[PDB]
Amino acid sequence: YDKWEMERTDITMKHKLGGGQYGEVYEGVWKKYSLTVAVKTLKEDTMEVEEFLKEAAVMKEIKHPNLVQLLGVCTREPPFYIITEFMTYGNLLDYLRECNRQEVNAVVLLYMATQISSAMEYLEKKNFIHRDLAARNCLVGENHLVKVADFGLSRLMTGDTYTAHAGAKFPIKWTAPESLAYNKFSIKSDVWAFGVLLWEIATYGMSPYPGIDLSQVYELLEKDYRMERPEGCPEKVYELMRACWQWNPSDRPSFAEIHQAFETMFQES
Numbered sequence: 001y002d003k004w005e006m007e008r009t010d011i012t013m014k015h016k017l018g019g020g021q022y023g024e025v026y027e028g029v030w031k032k033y034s035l036t037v038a039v040k041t042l043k044e045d046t047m048e049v050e051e052f053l054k055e056a057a058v059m060k061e062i063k064h065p066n067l068v069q070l071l072g073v074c075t076r077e078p079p080f081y082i083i084t085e086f087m088t089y090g091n092l093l094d095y096l097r098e099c100n101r102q103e104v105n106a107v108v109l110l111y112m113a114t115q116i117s118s119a120m121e122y123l124e125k126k127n128f129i130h131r132d133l134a135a136r137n138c139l140v141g142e143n144h145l146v147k148v149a150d151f152g153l154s155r156l157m158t159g160d161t162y163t164a165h166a167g168a169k170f171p172i173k174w175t176a177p178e179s180l181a182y183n184k185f186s187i188k189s190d191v192w193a194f195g196v197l198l199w200e201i202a203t204y205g206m207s208p209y210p211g212i213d214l215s216q217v218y219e220l221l222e223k224d225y226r227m228e229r230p231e232g233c234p235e236k237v238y239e240l241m242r243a244c245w246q247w248n249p250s251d252r253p254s255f256a257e258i259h260q261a262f263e264t265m266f267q268e269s
């Protein structure tokens with residue numbers, strides 16, 4: 001903990017990131033290293049202090065090439081900082097929508113899915129869940145490096161279930177049926193969300209279930225409606241989506257199985 005602690009005056013704030021989408025996140029400069037960093041701050045009513053401080057504590061334990069790396073914290077005295085590495089190309093959703101598809105082609109998409117599934121395999125092993133897997137929550141660096149934002153991770157042992165607080169509102173079109181109906185989350189609900197993320201990647205950032213009313217999504221899902229295969233999407237990639245969208249959570253593949261399948265497809269391309 002104290003090994004991560006640093007003075008606030010080691011950081012200079014340059015630009016506010018967002019805009020507002022992720023809260024109070026700023027582009028910053030770690031002066032002694034001339035290093036651009038991302039700085040999370042706590043305002044008046046952004047989030048509760050103890051939650052903010054727990055986010056910093058959890059990230060200290062997280063180390064993976066495809067998870068946003070913690071660099072330091074300022075947790076001795078307010079204003080509290082959380083300092084992480086900076087991903088120059090922003091979120092994956094806007095990246096896919098605005099990219100050159102001749103550069104970001106089929107093999108690059110597989111490479112992206114491989115990286116993300118690698119991070120989720122890690123979280124799966126370390127008994128963590130993400131609970132908001134989506135393109136908007138993945139970050140892109142140079143050479144199609146993709147990292148998953150890990151600022152809302154929850155501790156949960158394999159086979160256990162997290163029950164979301166009462167009155168919680170979910171990103172419905174990314175949300176597993178057991179979560180929509182009973183506020184229950186597990187690594188298998190992350191698997192479901194990963195399937196939607198795959199669909200986002202295959203469509204270069206199109207909105208899921210296009211035109212479909214949010215109020216009828218759950219009802220469609222229980223009658224085994226699923227999104228059709230996007231064009232250009234390899235059948236085996238789509239079969240991985242459909243596997244992620246099995247009704248029964250235990251029927252869904254593990255992230256270890258998902259990552260292995262993508263690693264094979266990526267290497268054999």
Ligand SMILES: *N1=[C]C2=C([C]=[C]1)[C]=C(O[C])C(C1=[C][N]C3=C1[C]=C(C1=[C]C(C(=O)N([C])[C]C#[C])=[C]N=[C]1)[C]=N3)=[C]2
Binds near residue numbers: 018088151
């Ligand atoms: N606490 C810390 C966070 C977040 C929530 C709570 C969310 C984040 O983004 C998902 C970060 C974060 C860490 N590294 C990082 C982060 C966000 C960006 C980013 C940059 C840009 C961008 O390039 N703009 C606006 C133009 C310029 C300059 C767009 N979106 C996201 C990059 N790296 C930390």
